[PDB]
Design a protein around this ligand. Structure first.
Ligand SMILES: Cc1c(Cl)cccc1C(=O)NS(=O)(=O)OC[C@H]1O[C@@H](n2cnc3c(N)ncnc32)[C@H](O)[C@@H]1O
Length: 521
């Protein structure tokens, strides 16, 4: 499986300093293979580390019998369910590199993912709109003829994922990919017209998990509510579900981050850490005002907030109105993750997004050309490090643009750095909307809008929204009258995630030639 390697002097340095430990990610689970402490709670269901590890082997083995081999890829679309973690570890034990699609992702996204990786295996959920019938499957498995095996959650027919997990592995020995080779594929937020996949090696991904655990001081006592989409890198590795498993803690799954669902789960299971995005934090504080008992969240000792910038106003209210410590998490699926420390001054936890988790994480601030700007100046985040990648998967065209000569990645974020060395996010250069933490590639949507017969020109732009931070607005120059429902219905036919539909559509007489920079003015 081809990916951009680190130069050898970098791989050697990162091994010498102990970042790369040359262990597979399977180690996170198999160190606990003897344990009967609870690893996953999912509604009424409680899986031990022993059971989880066994489930993973059971599935890994079942797939091996169906003829899935090491070095092959897989498309996995499971939500906030135990089977996400079983499937992730099953495929890691086989040496199969998956993409973890979010439940929200639809036709266009799955097709895009399947096209780049050419998967041998598809794992999806019959509770998904696309997988309740066999119509889409028939079409999907035709277009993506690489697919040989299909396993489906909440199926009682031939392709039942349960029957595989429940089938005890006779003599199974794991064959994880080498630790300096690809383990799995993360998803970019998106700056381009097609999704870009991020190769994560065991060495790079494990270190980010291991180092995240040190900072957030996760232990066997950690009870982590995983309420955001469980397959996202923030819920997965920062420190996320894996960080919890590593530590020997417990992951509590919730279908979404509504106060309606989570407030009960936090009190019931005595959760002491969870990860949210700004709008979820807002709705939580509003739910407390609207008269939810604050004592339901007594057990909470750390609340992570990331995916998008947290207003100091919102930040300051977390200790007061909820009564736990805040951690701001500024990270990206490409690698680099900045944390506030648990011992940081209120000043840094409220007004900054921390500093990189690795001492050998390297961060300078570029001007429009690409020269270093001195501290306190605002400019483009340029970074490289032991868990920051060196190329999207099979993207020589975009990789040329995305990295400078020395292998520094531009995140398309604008940042300043304090005298104390802390990063504050000041804005964004990449053509990306941040819809309450969820990322939309403006180009992806503009291309889809231009497919519409009435649409001459398309501009997708951010607009301030108090709840979400940003909402999508589609500016269209049209042949004929076009109402928002028509645009939205049309885009849903193309088959994309709901969050990607423009919250607002406006037909205008002209757009400038699109110069989005001027359209803001
Ligand atoms: C991967 C990730 C982790 Cl592991 C932890 C927290 C957030 C993310 C994340 O944001 N992942 S991402 O791939 O979906 O998007 C990366 C982009 O998300 C934005 N972002 C993430 N955290 C922030 C933040 N705290 N403040 C402002 N912007 C933020 C930023 O533009 C960054 O380039």
């Amino acid at each position: 499986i081809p990916f951009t390697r680190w130069p050898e002097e970098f791989a050697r340095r990162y091994r010498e300093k102990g970042y790369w430990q040359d262990l597979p990610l399977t180690d996170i689970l198999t160190r606990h293979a003897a344990s009967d402490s609870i690893a996953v709670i999912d509604g009424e269901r409680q899986l031990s580390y022993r059971e989880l590890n066994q489930a993973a082997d059971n599935l890994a083995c079942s797939l091996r019998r169906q003829g899935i081999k090491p070095g092959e890829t897989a498309l996995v679309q499971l939500g906030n369910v135990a089977e996400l973690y079983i499937t992730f570890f099953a495929l890691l034990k086989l040496g199969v590199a998956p993409v973890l699609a979010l439940f929200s992702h639809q036709r266009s996204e799955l097709n895009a993912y399947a096209s780049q990786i050419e998967p041998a295996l598809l794992i999806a959920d019959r509770q998904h709109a696309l997988f309740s019938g066999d119509d889409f499957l028939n079409t999907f498995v035709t277009e993506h003829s690489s697919i040989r095996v299909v396993q489906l959650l909440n199926d009682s027919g031939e392709h039942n994922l349960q029957d595989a997990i429940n089938h005890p592995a006779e003599d199974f020995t794991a064959t994880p990919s080498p630790a300096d080779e690809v383990a799995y594929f993360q998803l970019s937020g998106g700056t381009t017209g097609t999704p870009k996949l991020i190769p994560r090696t065991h060495n790079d991904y494990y270190y980010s998990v291991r180092r995240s655990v040190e900072i957030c001081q996760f232990t066997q006592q950690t009870r982590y509510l995983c309420a955001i989409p469980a397959a996202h890198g923030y819920a997965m590795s920062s420190p996320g579900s894996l960080g919890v498993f590593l530590a020997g803690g417990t992951v509590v799954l919730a279908a979404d981050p509504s106060a309606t669902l989570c407030f009960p789960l936090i009190e019931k299971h005595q959760v002491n850490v969870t990860a949210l995005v700004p709008p979820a934090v807002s709705l939580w504080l509003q739910a407390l005002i609207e008269g939810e008992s604050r004592a339901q969240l007594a057990s909470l000792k750390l609340l992570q907030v990331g995916g998008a910038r947290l207003s100091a106003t919102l930040a300051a209210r977390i200790p007061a109105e909820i009564g736990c410590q805040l951690q701001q998490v500024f990270g990206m699926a490409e690698g680099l993750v900045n944390y506030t420390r648990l011992d940081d001054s209120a000043e840094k936890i409220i007004h900054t997004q921390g500093y990189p988790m690795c001492p050998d994480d390297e961060v300078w601030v570029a001007d429009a050309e690409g020269n270093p700007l001195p501290q306190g100046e605002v400019g483009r985040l340029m970074t490289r490090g032991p868990y920051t990648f060196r190329g999207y998967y099979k993207s020589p065209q975009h990789n040329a643009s995305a990295f400078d000569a020395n292998g520094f990645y531009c995140s398309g974020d604008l940042i300043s750095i304090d005298p104390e060395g802390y990063i504050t996010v000041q804005g964004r250069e990449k053509d990306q909307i941040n819809r309450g933490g969820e990322k939309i590639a403006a180009e992806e949507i503009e291309n889809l809008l231009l497919r519409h017969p009435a649409v001459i020109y398309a501009a997708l732009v951010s607009m301030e929204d108090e709840l979400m931070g940003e909402k999508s607005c589609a500016y269209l120059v049209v042949k004929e009258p076009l109402r928002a429902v028509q645009v939205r219905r049309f885009l849903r036919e193309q088959g994309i995630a709901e969050f990607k539909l423009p919250d607002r559509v406006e037909c205008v007489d002209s757009l400038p030639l699109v110069d989005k920079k001027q359209l803001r003015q």
